[PDB]
Amino acid sequence: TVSAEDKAAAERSKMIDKNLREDGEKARRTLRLLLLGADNSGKSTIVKGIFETKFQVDKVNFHMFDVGGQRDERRKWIQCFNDVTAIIFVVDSSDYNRLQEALNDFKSIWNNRWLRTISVILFLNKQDLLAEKVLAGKSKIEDYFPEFARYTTPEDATPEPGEDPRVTRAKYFIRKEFVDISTASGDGRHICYPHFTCAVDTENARRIFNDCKDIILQMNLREYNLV
Amino acid sequence: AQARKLVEQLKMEANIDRIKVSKAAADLMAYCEAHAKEDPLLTPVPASENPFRE
Amino acid sequence: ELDQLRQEAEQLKNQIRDARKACADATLSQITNNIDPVGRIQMRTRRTLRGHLAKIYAMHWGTDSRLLVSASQDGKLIIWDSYTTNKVHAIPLRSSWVMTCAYAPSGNYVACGGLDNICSIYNLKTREGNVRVSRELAGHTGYLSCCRFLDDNQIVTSSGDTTCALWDIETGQQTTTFTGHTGDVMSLSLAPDTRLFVSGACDASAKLWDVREGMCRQTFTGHESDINAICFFPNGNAFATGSDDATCRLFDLRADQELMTYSHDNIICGITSVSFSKSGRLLLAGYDDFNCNVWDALKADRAGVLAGHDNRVSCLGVTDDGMAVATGSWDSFLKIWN
Amino acid sequence: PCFRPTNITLEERRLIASPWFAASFCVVGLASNLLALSVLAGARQGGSHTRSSFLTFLCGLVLTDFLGLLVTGTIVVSQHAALFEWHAVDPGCRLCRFMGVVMIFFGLSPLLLGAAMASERYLGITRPFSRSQRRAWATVGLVWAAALALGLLPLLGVGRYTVQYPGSWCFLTLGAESGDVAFGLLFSMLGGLSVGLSFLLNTVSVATLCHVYHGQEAAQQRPRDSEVEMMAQLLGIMVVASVCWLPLLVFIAQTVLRNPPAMSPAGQLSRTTEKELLIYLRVATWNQILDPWVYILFRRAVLRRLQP
Amino acid sequence: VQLVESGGGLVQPGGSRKLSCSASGFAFSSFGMHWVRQAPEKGLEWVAYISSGSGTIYYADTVKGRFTISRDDPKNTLFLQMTSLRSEDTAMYYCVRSIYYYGSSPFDFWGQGTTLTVSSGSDIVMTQATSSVPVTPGESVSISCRSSKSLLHSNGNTYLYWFLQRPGQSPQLLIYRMSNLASGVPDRFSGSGSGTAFTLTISRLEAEDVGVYYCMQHLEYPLTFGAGTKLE
Ligand SMILES: O=C(O)CCC/C=C\C[C@@H]1[C@@H](/C=C/[C@@H](O)COc2ccc(I)cc2)[C@H]2CC[C@@H]1O2
Ligand SMILES: CC(C)CCC[C@@H](C)[C@H]1CC[C@H]2[C@@H]3CC=C4C[C@@H](O)CC[C@]4(C)[C@H]3CC[C@]12C
Ligand SMILES: CC(C)CCC[C@@H](C)[C@H]1CC[C@H]2[C@@H]3CC=C4C[C@@H](O)CC[C@]4(C)[C@H]3CC[C@]12C
Ligand SMILES: CC(C)CCC[C@@H](C)[C@H]1CC[C@H]2[C@@H]3CC=C4C[C@@H](O)CC[C@]4(C)[C@H]3CC[C@]12C
Ligand SMILES: CC(C)CCC[C@@H](C)[C@H]1CC[C@H]2[C@@H]3CC=C4C[C@@H](O)CC[C@]4(C)[C@H]3CC[C@]12C
């Protein structure tokens, strides 16, 4: 049998289990996102050591974690974020010189073994600066990306409401570069939703909400169909 | 430009005394043989002496 | 001059390598070939401890050999009752990201830490009967990977800023700072005498540091990838290191050169944690393959497989009496093998 | 009561009442369920059961179908091969009552399990912002318990189990008896509600998934792939359920409500009614054979694993 | 830490009364509560106990169906309702807080005591043979307590508690489990046992170290106290 002290300890353990399950149920509703990017990008000013921010849209709560200060190699601490819903990646699309570095970083973050099931959100940032630069014509993308010289915008794509041909061509070239880096591996359970955003955009968290919904739906369908 | 610290540390590390590998192996073997009798994992103890036995 | 310093460093390295080669009079395998190997060490999950709702990242065995800690990603540090599986305590951590968990030798305080860069020491024997942050040590510029209680008031911690720090709980100040590593430090074990400790870094190097002197004594290399865990031999004259190369290593302090290597050629996953038995005959270690192999320290031969988990294995430890080999996995379940 | 004579004839013995039907159906069902169990073994061993409730329900359904097919095929094949007889070795009609209960149980459990899976699918697609593996097993146990209780109801005085043509089985009697009418209507209504709920939930899921697919992807972020495969699966299920199960149930209802009463005052049914009941039961038997085929085997990954 | 009990007074026979007990300075909701009754002439006597969360409630065989124990965690209060009080109920009631877990110290703290005056089988029989052992400061003394049943469960833990009640003060815990010393008490006290007879040994006496020593068992309810030994 069990003495009185043992019974009291068992009761305390049961109470602790009840508290733990209540906390887990409370904390399971929210979704955890990992914010990643470079110094040039506008990481912080996207949604209106550790630096976590909480925001709610459509009665859904998001915790965005913005781990900073651990530059160079992300290994040995990215393993923690192997269950997050998405990696919100931010890259400054205006800077052509830093585009190759951003592509290399995205390659490193996309083929990582511990992140082989999470879908990033590209959030091509600083649209206005890129539009102004391409309109001016002082800087040519072909200097750093010769293929862009032979690139033409897809004929089946939907042009923006009033975007000029040159800005559209540049935007689509950047998006195609990133998407192609995305599709070189990870046949399933991997997506690279390439939203294109301006410096100020109220309808920004809405994109994260929609893409998280799509990711959840896709994983549910994968589970349903695989067996 | 901080390069002398590494050299000094390397010299200090190299200034230690090293015994032969055979002596270390013999010491390890002797310790293992001596402490084998005191290893419940190595020698399965009777279920009576196992607190986790259920 | 930079060239002169580089030449001096190269000469010192060459001299060290030559001395190590000369000292390699024999090999451990040849000497131990004359001993009788252990046959098919098998173990079973005697007690299963559950309750956690997220991945388990750390574990420490209490000095009493009956209570153990477990830190989760849900900001929960649970102190169990393995002998009965009762949950003695459940501390809700301030930050959900915790990467280490240490139990004080006297069973009075528990240390936790992760990406926060702050080591939180909670006191268990409070007069009010509750558990609260006794102290919060800060000063590390990177995530805290490993920490151990040197004493009831002195705590040694390792962070990702390539440096180790020995603090003072009473004063909450960095008593000593050890630097020199070129990569993040992810391993740290306290010697039986609590005077020297070996720490492994991402540069595939293990450095021995003196608590009092606070200066590097020996540097051991050989691993082709980062080192994730290190443990001392029960005797205290040798230690073992695990890396991502899927092969463990055993070095001797006095020899100053690599002694033994452990691999099977059928294992490709990296090692997460290693531990030593009471007698030091075993080399229990984990793998990303969802299992732990009972490596023979003195024979470098596999004995058995503790295949019980469903996900990665993070932590592994052996009680002081050598009667429990509790491990933890990302499935949120601990398991006590015996 | 219980046992009742019959006047089977050689022509119908070799044409409609031949044991070939039962033997072939049992063998095919056992083989299909064995393939399903083999696939489920690897699927569970994989450990990818985050939404493990669906997989638990599927395992329960497959196991239920396997055991039901095995038991009923054994009994029927033994009876047809003249290995025993009801009057000879079953003066204790309890054997017939056991057959009736194990028939109702295995004919009502699959429908409820399908309805539960349909609810799971609806919630996992139309509301993807919601949600242990223990609640799933609890629900499976509850469904099995409900089926068993409904099957046992006639024992404690609601329905009545009687031998049926051609003498190789016994099943809930159809007639004017008020208790028999109540039992027949209850069985028919439970079956109809289960199939209808599954139909409606699968229709909503298919509509939402098709809206997502045809919904402008702009750049076609990824090939629809899953979003169509699942659709196809869902559609098939509907048919493979309704066509297979709606007929028999409806027939039962009519027989227990069609005036004048189908069964004679002495308890003998018209030959046409018995033949129709046998044909409808035979066609409805294919739901259990096809459930593993339409839930696991037809899947592309399952087929690839089943390839040489 | 603080436990203040009130509500006592003069109650006629057959009446009803309520005793309140307020706890402060510690987590009341995580600590089980005990009501200890001390008669004007007799020693301590357990009355009722309520576990954490009110899940488990135990009452002494002496009072059955009359004494009700309740706890209000949000208010951090303990209520003892007595109905149909009789002459025997005349005694002093004390609140005791106990937390049950591995390495815990049950009955760590005791209340100040509230008086209450009324006008007009298969239980451990632990007995304290010693009745009066006068001593002198600077000497060593020994106190013995005997039990009718082996207070040693298969787990290997001896469930014994030695308490001291100095004059003009409420009882204070000295030793728990017969092996581990209480918190804050001097190291002079030493408890020993063999499973049937238990002994306290004091190497050096002091003016503060004087009062009545009680031995109690917690192996199984109801709790039974010893006769009590008074020093001099
Ligand atoms: O004399 C015959 O030729 C069989 C006449 C019908 C009697 C039983 C159906 C069984 C079939 C299998 C059945 C199980 O899969 C359970 O299937 C149910 C279907 C409908 C109901 I309502 C209840 C159960 C198959 C294997 C043995 C039998 O032939
Ligand atoms: C390929 C799968 C789907 C078919 C499984 C059922 C098949 C094998 C069954 C269904 C109908 C059956 C036939 C029904 C009636 C007769 C008449 C007589 O001559 C005996 C055999 C024979 C000819 C049966 C042979 C087996 C049969 C063809
Ligand atoms: C899980 C599968 C195999 C279904 C098993 C259902 C079991 C529980 C059913 C099948 C046959 C049933 C029995 C059929 C007939 C009788 C005789 C009656 O006087 C008492 C009840 C009793 C003894 C039933 C008890 C329940 C029973 C044993
Ligand atoms: C047909 C065009 C004009 C309308 C397209 C949008 C809506 C109305 C369509 C898209 C998918 C459709 C469903 C697809 C499949 C079926 C199954 C069939 O057995 C009944 C109708 C039902 C349930 C359809 C109902 C109508 C539906 C929801
Ligand atoms: C996809 C679903 C519908 C399954 C495939 C069709 C099934 C229902 C078909 C295939 C063979 C068919 C059987 C073939 C022959 C006969 C003999 C006839 O005198 C009565 C009906 C009966 C016994 C048929 C019943 C329906 C049946 C079993």
Instruction: Kindly indicate whether the domain formed by C1-338 is annotated with CATH number 3.40.50.10310.
Output: no
E strand or H helix at B11: helix B3-14
Q: What is the dihedral of CA D14, D19, D20, D23, to 10 degrees?
A: 180
**Sign of torsion over alpha carbons E102, E103, E106, E110:** negative
**Burial tier of A69 (Cβ tally within 10 Å: 0-12, 13-18, 19+):** middle
D226-257 and A205-226 helices, crossing angle to 10°: 60
DSSP state of A113: G
User: The tokens of D201 are what?
Assistant: 């939930």
According to DSSP, the residues that pair with E201 across neighbouring strands are E142, E190
Contact yes or no for A8 and E101 at CB 8 A? yes
Inform me whether the C-beta atom of residue D229 falls under 8 Å from chain A C-beta atoms.
yes
DSSP state of A196: B
Q: Do β-strands E10-11 and E114-118 pair in parallel, antiparallel, or remain unpaired? A: parallel
User: CATH number of the domain that A29 lies in?
Assistant: 3.40.50.300
- Separation of alpha carbons D212 and D193, rounded Å: 29
DSSP state of C83: T
Q: Which residues of D touch A156 (CB under 8 A)?
A: none
- Measure C219 CA to nearest chain E CA, in Å: 43
- Separation of alpha carbons C261 and C248, rounded Å: 6
Instruction: Kindly indicate whether the domain formed by B1-52 is annotated with CATH number 2.60.40.1190.
Output: no
- Separation of alpha carbons E228 and E2, rounded Å: 26
Tell me the three state secondary structure of residue A106.
helix
Pick from C315, C282, C312: nearest CA to C146: C315
A in contact with C (at least 3 C-beta pairs within 8 A) = yes
Nearest CA to ligand 2 atom 2: D28
Contact yes or no for A227 and D296 at CB 8 A? yes
- Separation of alpha carbons A11 and A120, rounded Å: 45
A4, A9, A11 member nearest E220 (Cβ): A4
According to DSSP, the residues that pair with A144 across neighbouring strands are none
- Separation of alpha carbons C39 and B42, rounded Å: 10
Q: Which residues of B touch C279 (CB under 8 A)?
A: 31-32, 35-36, 38-39, 42
Pick from B29, B22, B46: nearest CA to C281: B29
Tell me the three state secondary structure of residue A174.
helix
Indicate the CATH number of D10-306 among 2.40.40.20, 3.90.226.10, 2.60.120.380, 1.20.1070.10: 1.20.1070.10
Q: Which residues of C touch A21 (CB under 8 A)?
A: 53
Q: Do β-strands C196-201 and C205-210 pair in parallel, antiparallel, or remain unpaired? A: antiparallel
User: The tokens of D278 are what?
Assistant: 């046998």
Q: Do β-strands C86-92 and C76-81 pair in parallel, antiparallel, or remain unpaired? A: antiparallel
Inform me whether the C-beta atom of residue A114 falls under 8 Å from chain C C-beta atoms.
no
Tell me the three state secondary structure of residue E232.
coil
Q: Identify whether the C-beta of residue A151 lies closer than 8 Å to the C-beta of residue A169.
A: yes
DSSP E133-196: E---TTS-EEEEEE-SS--B-TTS-B-EEEEEE-TTS--EEEEETTTEE-SS--TTEEEEE-SS
The total of other beta-carbon atoms located within 10 Å of residue C126's CB is: 13
CA distances from A112 to A78, A108, A147 (A): 9, 6, 27
D52-80 and D20-46 helices, crossing angle to 10°: 160
User: The tokens of A49 are what?
Assistant: 């050591």
Q: Phi, psi at residue D211, to the nearest 5°? A: -65, -40
Residues sharing a CB contact under 8 Å with residue E189, sequence separation 6 or more, in sequence order: E162, E174, E175, E181, E200, E201, E202
Residues sharing a CB contact under 8 Å with residue B42, sequence separation 6 or more, in sequence order: B36, C38, C41, C277, C279, C281, C282
Which residue is closest to A51 within chain C, CA to CA? C116
CA distances from E172 to C130, D142, E8, E166 (A): 21, 55, 22, 8
Q: Identify whether the C-beta of residue C248 lies closer than 8 Å to the C-beta of residue C220.
A: no
- Separation of alpha carbons A14 and A21, rounded Å: 11
Q: Which residues of E touch A3 (CB under 8 A)?
A: 153, 155, 157, 159, 219-220
DSSP E16-32: EEEEEEEEESS-GGGSE
Instruction: Kindly indicate whether the domain formed by E2-118 is annotated with CATH number 3.40.50.12780.
Output: no
Break chain E down into helix, strand, coil percent, rounded to 5: 5, 45, 50
Atom of ligand 4 at shortest range from CA of D207: 28
Q: Identify whether the C-beta of residue A84 lies closer than 8 Å to the C-beta of residue A120.
A: no
Amino acid at C132: R
| D98 Cα–ligand 3 center, Å | 6
DSSP state of C111: E
E strand or H helix at C256: none
The total of other beta-carbon atoms located within 10 Å of residue A61's CB is: 12
Q: What are the extents of the domains in chain E?
A: 2-118, 127-232
List alpha helices for chain A, DSSP H.
4-28, 99-110, 127-136, 165-183, 205-226
- Separation of alpha carbons C137 and C157, rounded Å: 10
**Sign of torsion over alpha carbons C81, C85, C87, C91:** positive
DSSP A175-191: HHHHHHHHHTS--SS--
Amino acid at C93: L
Pick from D203, D293, D186, D278: nearest CA to D242: D203
> Which ligand does the CA of D29 lie closest to?
1
**Sign of torsion over alpha carbons A41, A45, A47, A53:** positive
CA count, 13 A, side-chain hemisphere, B25: 22
The total of other beta-carbon atoms located within 10 Å of residue E152's CB is: 18
Chains touching B, CB cut-off 8 Å, 3+ pairs:
C
CA C143 to centroid of chain Cα atoms: 16
- Separation of alpha carbons E199 and E146, rounded Å: 9
Q: What is the CA radius of gyration of chain C?
A: 20
DSSP state of C160: T
Pick from A92, A123, A130: nearest CA to A192: A123
Tell me the three state secondary structure of residue C50.
coil
- Separation of alpha carbons E198 and C200, rounded Å: 53
In three state form, how does the secondary structure of C173-230 look? EEEEEEECCCCCECCCEECCCCCEEEEEECCCEEEEEECCCCCEEEEECCCCCCEEEE
Beta strands across the sheet bearing C227-232: C227-232, C238-243, C248-252, C258-262
- Separation of alpha carbons D95 and D93, rounded Å: 5
D128, D219, D301 member nearest A220 (Cβ): D128
Chains touching C, CB cut-off 8 Å, 3+ pairs:
A, B, E
C5, C8, C338 member nearest B50 (Cβ): C338
- Separation of alpha carbons D144 and D151, rounded Å: 10
CA distances from A163 to A134, A135, A157, A171, C254 (A): 11, 11, 13, 10, 72
**Sign of torsion over alpha carbons D198, D203, D206, D212:** negative
Q: What are the extents of the domains in chain B?
A: 1-52
DSSP state of E128: -
Contact yes or no for A225 and D121 at CB 8 A? no
According to DSSP, the residues that pair with E229 across neighbouring strands are E213
- Separation of alpha carbons C285 and C297, rounded Å: 11
Residues sharing a CB contact under 8 Å with residue A80, sequence separation 6 or more, in sequence order: C73, C97, C99, C114, C115
Tell me the three state secondary structure of residue C249.
strand
Residues sharing a CB contact under 8 Å with residue D89, sequence separation 6 or more, in sequence order: none
CA count, 13 A, side-chain hemisphere, A175: 21
- Separation of alpha carbons B53 and C17, rounded Å: 51
The total of other beta-carbon atoms located within 10 Å of residue A23's CB is: 16
Q: Identify whether the C-beta of residue C155 lies closer than 8 Å to the C-beta of residue C137.
A: yes
In three state form, how does the secondary structure of chain D look? CCCCCCCCCHHHHHHCCCCHHHHHHHHHHHHHHHHHHHHHHHHHHHCCCCCHHHHHHHHHHHHHHHHHHHHHHHHHHHHHCCCCCHHHHCCCCHHHHHHHHHHHHHHHHHHHHHHHHHHHHHHHHHCCCCCCCHHHHHHHHHHHHHHHHHHHHHHHCCCCEEEECCCCEEEECCCCCHHHHHHHHHHHHHHHHHHHHHHHHHHHHHHHHHHHHHCCCCCCCCCCCHHHHHHHHHHHHHHHHHHHHHHHHHHHHHHHHCCCCCCCCCCCCCHHHHHHHHHHHHHHCHHHHHHHHHHHHCCHHHHHHHCC
Residues sharing a CB contact under 8 Å with residue E68, sequence separation 6 or more, in sequence order: E80, E81, E83
According to DSSP, the residues that pair with E158 across neighbouring strands are E152
Inform me whether the C-beta atom of residue B47 falls under 8 Å from chain C C-beta atoms.
no
E strand or H helix at C165: strand C163-168
Nominal resolution in Å? 3.2
| D283 Cα–ligand 5 center, Å | 6
**Burial tier of D179 (Cβ tally within 10 Å: 0-12, 13-18, 19+):** middle
**Burial tier of E19 (Cβ tally within 10 Å: 0-12, 13-18, 19+):** buried
The total of other beta-carbon atoms located within 10 Å of residue D41's CB is: 11
CA distances from C249 to C184, C224, C260, D58, D206 (A): 19, 11, 6, 47, 57
- Separation of alpha carbons C186 and C272, rounded Å: 10
Q: Identify whether the C-beta of residue E188 lies closer than 8 Å to the C-beta of residue E203.
A: yes
E strand or H helix at A60: strand A60-65
Q: Identify whether the C-beta of residue A147 lies closer than 8 Å to the C-beta of residue A114.
A: no
- Separation of alpha carbons A38 and A95, rounded Å: 12
- Separation of alpha carbons C114 and C95, rounded Å: 8
Residues sharing a CB contact under 8 Å with residue E79, sequence separation 6 or more, in sequence order: E18, E19, E20, E21, E69, E70, E71, E72
The total of other beta-carbon atoms located within 10 Å of residue D151's CB is: 24
The total of other beta-carbon atoms located within 10 Å of residue D189's CB is: 12
Experimental method used, please?
cryo-EM
Q: Identify whether the C-beta of residue C123 lies closer than 8 Å to the C-beta of residue C104.
A: no
- Separation of alpha carbons D78 and C255, rounded Å: 79
Nearest CA to ligand 5 atom 11: D283
Beta strands across the sheet bearing C216-220: C189-190, C196-201, C205-210, C216-220
Measured between its terminal Cα atoms, the distance across chain E in Å is: 31
Its domain, for residue A189, covers 4-224
Which residue is closest to A21 within chain D, CA to CA? D132
Q: Identify whether the C-beta of residue A38 lies closer than 8 Å to the C-beta of residue A66.
A: no
Amino acid at E92: M
CA distances from A95 to A167, A182, D62 (A): 14, 20, 58
Domains E2-118 and E127-232 fall in the same CATH topology: yes
Largest CA distance in chain E: 51
Q: Identify whether the C-beta of residue E45 lies closer than 8 Å to the C-beta of residue E36.
A: yes
D279 lines ligand 5 (CB under 6 A): yes
Which residue is closest to A7 within chain E, CA to CA? E100
E strand or H helix at C86: strand C86-92
Give the CA angle between residues A104, A110, A113 to the nearest 5°: 120
- Measure C334 CA to nearest chain B CA, in Å: 15
CATH dotted code for E127-232: 2.60.40.10
Conformational region of residue E211, where left means phi above 0, alpha means psi within -120 to 50, and beta covers everything else: left
User: The tokens of C124 are what?
Assistant: 């268990």
According to DSSP, the residues that pair with E172 across neighbouring strands are E164
- Tokens 């002495």 correspond to D266
Nearest CA to ligand 5 atom 6: D283
Tell me the three state secondary structure of residue A55.
strand
Conformational region of residue A123, where left means phi above 0, alpha means psi within -120 to 50, and beta covers everything else: left
E strand or H helix at E60: none
CA C77 to centroid of chain Cα atoms: 18
Pick from C193, C194, C217: nearest CA to C206: C217
A in contact with E (at least 3 C-beta pairs within 8 A) = yes
- Separation of alpha carbons A95 and A39, rounded Å: 12
- Tokens 């209507």 correspond to D185
- Separation of alpha carbons C273 and C286, rounded Å: 5
User: The tokens of B26 are what?
Assistant: 């013999």
**Burial tier of C64 (Cβ tally within 10 Å: 0-12, 13-18, 19+):** middle
E strand or H helix at B34: helix B21-36
